[PDB]
Amino acid sequence: FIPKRRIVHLDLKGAAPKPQHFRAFFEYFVRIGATGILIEWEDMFPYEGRLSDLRNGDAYSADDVRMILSTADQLRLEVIPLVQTIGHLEWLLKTHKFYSFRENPRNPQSVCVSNAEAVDLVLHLVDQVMAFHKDYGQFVHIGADEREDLLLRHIVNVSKHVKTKYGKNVLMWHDMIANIDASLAEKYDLKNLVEPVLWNYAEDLEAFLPMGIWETFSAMVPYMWGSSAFKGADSPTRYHSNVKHYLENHISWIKQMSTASEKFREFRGLIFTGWQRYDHFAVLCEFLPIGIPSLTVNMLTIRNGRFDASVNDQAISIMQCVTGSDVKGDLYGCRFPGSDIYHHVQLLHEKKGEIEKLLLQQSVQGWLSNIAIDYNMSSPWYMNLIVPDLMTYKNQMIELSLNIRQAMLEMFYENAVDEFLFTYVDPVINHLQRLLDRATAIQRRDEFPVRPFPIK
Ligand SMILES: [Zn+2]
């Protein structure tokens, strides 16, 4: 079983490329056998009217969006918009402006389904997007991911609005309905309204997925999609490439689809998720350039129906990496969009592992403790072995920061680089510097007090 639709998620909640660089990405997406993309604009769309105010400051122009979709179209890439319609609306409801619209007045996450002024804002939001996307895809994704009648009547509502006005098929995330009685699904004629997208980013799905989950859903709907991950599902603070993880998800998905393909009028395809933050408010996870290796190997793996040293190897020559090499281990001299940023961030991963190993060895542990730092009281001799290592790693991390800023600044907006550095690079420079200061001060002491000396 090979999914005929293979869709690459583009999550713009953060680290949203500058607009001239989508062509490159998209051409790469063709070159690995993607049929389409899923664009979650979040706050980066050129919103207008009442929504103009909840736009990212670095938001994309009308002329940009029109060029992005054209470029997609010309490269024979389908475009599915993702618009959140119930939850994950922090970007919209978190100012004063729509405070009134929230399910819970403290949480900027959900909108009150039962408040029709709010449902109205949602439908405008849909229409503002579909304005641009209408001429360019057969599908729309409405979210409804991470009393049941109010939910389903909200979905129904939204679905029909899209189906009717734009003649497209609605996809939503599965979690909202996996529980519900087959009965309620029929009551709301869901077999005719929505295509559930089942998502699971685990390595062994066989471990996490209930049994006859597929049997459950085929008894409810004719159309089903699946959703794997290439990035944004290791850890929230995952900033580097861990291909081994995503690859397990993809192998584990092949087996699943090869059992589920046949119980549906059509298993439509798989969406390769690529979260940029775990949520609006979370930190930046792995940048798209960092996810290219994962994404390359996992596309080829789903189209070849399994992973083998053949897959590995086409993968590499597509990335124009240096021959030999393993896609699961280190890669050198690759040439793909953002490949410099990859190179540099992967170095960051390595340097930081060294630095943590040094901060965990006997020297720093025993003689650069908190009492050493606060009471300038330790062995000069131990300093002489530490201070040199602190200074090297500190200076290397300073140069890494420069390089990454330069690399990332050709493709990303400042805030995104500033956020990355602030999160994943700078705290270490600061921490090395503060240790280097105290270890240097102790290295300069020659006279120490007899014990005991006051402590608190
Ligand atoms: Zn409510």
- Three-state SS letters, the chain: CCCCEEEEEEECCCCCECHHHHHHHHHHHHHCCCCEEEEECCCCCCCCHHHHHHCCCCCCCHHHHHHHHHHHHHCCCEEEEECCCCCCCHHHHCCCCCHHHECCCCCCCCECCCCHHHHHHHHHHHHHHHHHHHHHCCEEECCCCCCHHHHHHHHHHHHHHHHHHHCCEEEEEHHHCCCCCHHHHHHCCHHHCEEEEEECCCCCHHHHCCCCHHHHHHCCCCEEEEEEEEECCCCCCCCCCCHHHHHHHHHHHHHHHHHHHHHCCEEEEEEEEECCECCCCCCECCCHHHHHHHHHHHHHHHHCCCCCHHHHHHHHHHHCCCCCCCCCCCCCCCCCCCHHHHHHHHHHHHHHHHHHHHHHCHHHHHHCCHHHHHCCCCCHHHHHHHHHHHHHHHHHHHHHHHHHHHHHHHHECHHHHHHHHHHHCHHHHHHHHHHHHHHHHHHCCCCCCCCCCCCC
- 10 Å Cβ neighbour count for 299? 24
d(CA 121, CA 154): 13
Question: 188 C-alpha vs ligand 1 centroid, how far in Å?
Answer: 19
- Residue 280 CA: distances (Å) to CA of 55, 171, 263, 276, 413: 13, 21, 36, 9, 17
In the chain, the N- to C-terminal Cα span, in Å, equals: 66
Q: How was this structure determined?
A: X-ray
Task: Report the distance separating Cα 51 and Cα 313, nearest Å.
Answer: 47
CA of 383 relative to ligand 1 center, distance in Å:
62
Q: How far is CA 266 from CA 200, 226, 269, 273, 318, in A?
A: 19, 12, 9, 20, 31
Give just the sign of the alpha carbon dihedral 120, 223, 278, 312.
negative
286 annotated to bind ligand:
no
Cα of 223 to ligand 1 centre, how many Å? 29
Tell me, what amino acid is at 407?
Answer: A
Q: Which residues have C-beta within 8 Å of that of residue 275, sequence separation ≥ 6?
A: 9, 11, 13, 229, 231, 232, 233, 285
Determine how β-strand 78-81 pairs with β-strand 194-199. unpaired
Amino acid identity at 238: R
Distances (CA, A) of 9 to 66, 241, 275, 336: 19, 17, 8, 18
Strand order in the sheet with 194-199: 78-81, 36-40, 5-11, 266-274, 223-231, 194-199, 169-173, 139-141
Q: How far is the CA of 335 from the centre of ligand 1 (A)?
A: 50
- Distance, CA of 93 to CA of 335 (rounded, Å): 41
Q: Is 172 exposed, middle or buried (0-12, 13-18, 19+ CB in 10 A)?
A: buried
For 158, 393, 423, the CA distances from 238, given in Å and listed in that order, are 34, 21, 11
Rounded Cα gap, residues 222 and 411, in angstroms: 41
CA of 83 to the centre of ligand 1 (A): 20
Strand 78-81, strand 169-173: pairing = unpaired
Q: How many CA atoms lie within 13 A of 388 on its CB side?
A: 5
From CA 64, how far away is CA 58, in angstroms rounded?
12
> Could you give the CA distance from residue 377 to residue 374 in angstroms, rounded to a whole number?
8
d(CA 382, CA 387): 9
- What lies within 8 Å, CB to CB, of 206 at 6+ separation is 252, 255, 256
Ligand 1 centroid – CA 147 distance (Å): 9
User: Residue 200, by phi and psi: left (phi above 0), alpha (psi -120 to 50) or beta?
Assistant: beta
Measured in angstroms, how far is the CA atom of residue 114 from the centroid of ligand 1? 5
For residue 146, indicate whether it is catalytic: yes
Q: Ligand 1 centroid vs 108 CA: distance in angstroms? A: 13
Contact 268, 224 (CB under 8 A): yes
Phi-psi bin for 413: left (phi > 0), alpha (psi -120 to 50), beta?
beta
The type of residue at 348 is L
Task: Find the catalytic residue in 27, 117, 146, 354.
Answer: 146
Q: At a CB cut-off of 8 Å and minimum separation 6, what does 384 contact?
A: 443
Going from the Cα of 151 to the center of ligand 1, the distance in angstroms, rounded, reads 9
Q: Is 103 annotated as a binding residue?
A: yes
